[PDB]
Chains A and B, each alone.
With several copies, the nearest count.
Chain A
């Protein structure tokens, strides 16, 4: 869960091994300064079945989408960090993990959507279409 919180609160993995259920394909040498695949939302940040612990399978889509949103704000120059972090543990048929995953999810989407709707304005891009 510390490796998880590293992937969650900032888009960079601060673990210098890859054990985690998310892996990053290296498609950085195909699409750079242009998108012709939409690699972020297809399979660059993908999940792997045999690293799912089978109690995070209910949260799996959420866990993936969280840090996938963080990368495209942490890359361009916006300072983002954790708003708060708290310990989560596998407990028997009870969850510390769900409450942090949901708050993490809303923080992910809120910082991406707020940063985009002000700098690199989507509003004018849709209006000029």
Chain B
């Protein structure tokens, strides 16, 4: 599918972002980790903000 572009588009960002977030939140637990994932909702950024905000809602539960 154009050499698998449109297959890849939805998990591509979710793989980069979660692979970033696992090594950014190492050494951090609780409220400090909850802030370190709410760190990503800051240029507005509707494409990234739609992605992170569901995960953060469970993370800060």
A interface SS class: loop
B interface SS class: loop
In the complex, which residue of chain B has the Cβ closest to the Cβ of A3? Answer: B44
In the complex, which residue of chain A has the Cβ closest to the Cβ of B38? Answer: A16
* Residues of chain A at interface, number, CB under 8 A: 5
CB-CB under 8 A from A19, the residues of chain B are 43-44
CB-CB under 8 A from B42, the residues of chain A are 16-17
CB distance from A42 to the nearest CB of B (A): 27
CB distance from B59 to the nearest CB of A (A): 16
CB distance from B36 to the nearest CB of A (A): 14
Interface residues of B in 16-61 (CB under 8 A from A): 38, 41-44
CB-CB under 8 A from A16, the residues of chain B are 38, 41-42
In the complex, 11 of the A-B residue pairs with CB atoms within 8 angstroms, ordered by the A residue number, are: A3-B44, A15-B44, A16-B38, A16-B41, A16-B42, A17-B41, A17-B42, A17-B43, A17-B44, A19-B43, A19-B44
